[PDB]
Symmetry: D3
Subunit: 234 residues, 6 copies
């Protein structure tokens, strides 16, 4: 059994949603899945597997940050995951984005050290699996939920990024910051699995707190519905 | 008038194809465009403008490498370009890719110094405009032309890359090597225009020569046709 | 209230132990603390506050990786933490360090991106607060528990480091690898608080699994006792 | 036959001038050579070969940027080029440099990604062949043409360099900015050939337009004269 | 016999003090040691061996800069040196440090190229031998001499560092700047010898001259006494 | 009076030879100068001033490494030095270089941290003053001493370079390795003074000892003579 996600190959489905927060993982399992069963809780990395419209789907907590997420993704692939979609939150890099809005990550600027270590410092363009990406975009459109399609930035130091630095990045196409996408995308290609990422804007860089829980939760629900429908398309 | 592409307002259409080879530009204008006109020849950067199915389309030579391509794009934008699609060739980094095959660039690993200079050395994920990327993908399908969707690597030292290095990169998702995409994608976001890139494998890294004129020409013909259809879609 | 550690200053003591695993945090509170109470469980970052020999001591989960630990440490300082000591595990960089052995971290090689982001890429020498370092060392002696004193390396890509690479680093003084120390030390100096780290070897890097429970548990129990005694010293 | 510069050993002399602009390559081949024969026009890399004072001299277009230049230089060496002297223009980084003034490049600051790729990110000091350098310098003095001897900087992002940055570099000895010398010098040492570079200032960084064609044209004339004389002496 | 420090094994004691100034070396030998004997003067790298409380002790000049100190350290280790303690001067990074104040280096920010070359650019945390570091701290306390315990930064360009930069580093824990510690600490681990460093503040970054010779001399005296007592402890 | 080279403006002449070894500075002063006088011995940086063919000439010790040499050069400039020529030794990087062979440095690969700091990490091509370089070359020819003209590499870690790396650098034009040139050349441009460097091969990278005393000694004499003649020319 893997060191951190202490499960067994038969526990994980080929399709997996990857929320960073264990509380959201549980909410997803109980709100959307049939016969959900928790296969892991070691290190608080709550992982669940159930059925969504007749198809097996797992929901695995990644923790915060690319180091934590890389560990989970690497072990997930070992356990049999083949399609992995991150469902997280992000901080808007501009007033253009409003809390609750969705972002289908077209690519992720690698401002983290996990992708850097794997790459031995070489340049790279972290992108999701093209099929998964397309399906996430399609579903978001179909459902009609307010969304954007473009770049996010995966960072390591959450409290280091200033509003001024955020504005600067937005000028280069960055819509928001988050802390996991880049490594997921990289590992997708390295391990030969399909990955994708959709995010719900929970606030704007510089803000001392997150948007109203009402706002946030509706955004999360939309995001998860899009991802669940998308993973069944691939 | 710009320094390198010496044209004036009205010469360049909103939609532009960007072949690196001036020979190809001429062949594209004379083969697909009605009443093509050459607005520039300065520094061999041949630029033509004509009609494709009633819509104005320009074909501008970029030259080889991102420094050259960057100059041409910066000036094209100043002249009125708003949708720029690179139509070029690339070297397969793997063995699964066959010469003549098409590649819709989902992103470009920035291995060039041009993007690095604009970014001041910071990490980045060069990606095309999502709608353009999508339109190219869709069109490739509608025409039924065999294609691949994914990463290419934009490099500076054509003769430095070794088959061994190419193979290593392929294990990271790089489908092939070319020398222009990264800077085009970056500028697209920096200047607020829509960019894209479609390539035609013309060889495998390590080969002393390109592929047979015909096998390669059919690829180039299909690539240009997909790009024309796609630019009219946005 | 902080974004991730949703608590109030009055809930957190000045002396805090920082385990990476929420399971160990819970085990520490129940095993060593008097009247322990869980003040946070948001995101699975279990945090408890109780009493050790009459002195208030908090045990806060950091999660894995410097990005996660940095978030927790930043919010703790905001909550009133003044003395923070990491109590975790590490993989031995050479065949001579046996599982269960304790390591008082004299320093932490910054192989992570979190410190890199905060430092804007500049060189640095992550070190604990001298007095805390000294107390940890002294207590280990007072308790008569076999221990090593030296450098550890804080990494981001757990699964990228090969046993050969680990050993190469051992030649430079690295006793073992972990994923949090560097950021804790840096923030200690940046925020003006006292920090330290003590580790229990859980495996010799390269092992498919961790050491047998009893061997590792005794070491973990010893590490914790040294830490608790040490924070009361400052 | 070279991929880009389609020619064969026999078409190229041992002594070669290297203008970036194909238009200048033609002017030179016609204005100073006797019986000039164009051996290549592929990709607009107009290449000629004739006789200067009874000696065979090739004039080969490199294109703009070290990526393009590196490809042309690498192939010329394969065709048998032994002495390659670049004859280009540059943008003054100083205010004491007037358009038309010549510059015998003593070295080239490598701000380009091409040299960086060949060097694998290692530091270097791009310099011409010592003999060629002295020849150009000596000829310039003999012909009494106003000139400077010093450093230039080879850049990638033409439109990224600001007057402010250019002034800063000037204080470190940089006389002007160009886009090809560094790679040429590096390849000269790598491939064991003699290289050199002389430049005619066409403007000052910040200027939207170049200097009067009249003043500028004379500079090119003098420059070419110096270069031609020099290549024969080695 | 080594290239620079031309002594033979038998001239050098296991315990050694390392002043950068040969003038201080001579002064230390004649002031504190019994029967001082000079074993080397080649290249002005004056080295002496005598007795301190019946224990053999050497005083070896390192010269200024890590390149020079690295050469001397390398050769001393080759000659059998086992405990090496630097006794130098440093420039206060903040106005919090008064001239003549002693600093027990807990670590040293590697802003030098010597450590960079040895580490091939990799990150690192240069730290003293833990036992030596502790002995220095202990002795400072016993002798009753005021002192600070913390980080210093080892730089290469004495005249490049500005007051603003100095105050920026002070925010990250840097107490003062010096020019040899980082390399000593690194070689300490690489060559398996025990190292340490104690410094006397001789000025503030930005000061045209050093502090009062009388105040400085007293600081140097105390420093040397501490080092001597310390090396006898290991 | 400067901090390290404690001299008065009237002590140093406009023309200065910069040996790294103090013993060589003295030999030079006594062997070639009329009425030589030592104006400084502080920190072992022995400096002399005398007359060479009726022209004042100073001989200043720089110590080993760019950090030490930078301090000396910075101070010599502040004292009025106008022409500074380094006269040192170097380690041959290839096999075609015999011991005692002279090298007139055309440029210096900056593998050092001193130049790196002054340049804030930016690329650069350290080169001597054109006229000085020219003079040294011409004089070596005049005196008819066998010489080489080309690149040397200035390094920080004398004992880090291996024969393998040395051979690798030779393929890039690096004739030999030394430890001062790069910083001298950079400061030359920065401070507005004329600098140069001529070297005598004392060994081959990897040799345990230097070349035979007389083989090298003859080279050093020829070297000093070339430098003296050259400085009087500028
Ligand atoms: Cl399944
Ligand atoms: Cl139009
Ligand atoms: Cl408390
Ligand atoms: Cl010929
Ligand atoms: Cl001894
Ligand atoms: Cl004088």
């Amino acid at each position: 059994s893997p060191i951190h996600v202490r499960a067994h190959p038969g526990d994980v489905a080929e399709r997996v949603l990857l929320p960073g927060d264990p509380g959201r993982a549980e909410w997803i399992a109980k709100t959307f899945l049939q016969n959900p069963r928790r296969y892991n809780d070691h290190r608080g990395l709550w992982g669940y597997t159930g059925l969504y419209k007749g198809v097996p789907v797992s929901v695995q907590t990644t923790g915060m940050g690319t180091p934590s997420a890389a560990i989970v993704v690497e072990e997930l692939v070992r356990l049999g995951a083949r399609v992995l979609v991150r469902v997280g939150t992000a901080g808007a890099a501009s007033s253009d984005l409003a809390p609750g809005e969705l972002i289908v990550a077209q690519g992720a600027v690698p401002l983290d050290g996990t992708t850097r270590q794997y790459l031995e410092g070489r340049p790279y363009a972290p992108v999701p699996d093209p099929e998964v990406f397309r399906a996430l975009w399609r579903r978001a459109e179909a459902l009609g939920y307010p969304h954007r399609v473009g770049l996010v930035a995966s960072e390591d130091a959450f409290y280091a990024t200033t509003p001024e630095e955020a504005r600067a990045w937005a000028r280069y196409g960055v819509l928001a910051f988050e802390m996991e996408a880049s490594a997921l995308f990289l590992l997708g290609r390295m391990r030969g699995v399909r990955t994708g990422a959709i995010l719900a804007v929970s606030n704007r860089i510089g803000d001392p707190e997150l948007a109203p829980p009402e706002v946030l939760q509706e955004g999360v629900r939309r995001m998860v519905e899009v991802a669940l429908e998308a993973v069944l398309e691939v």
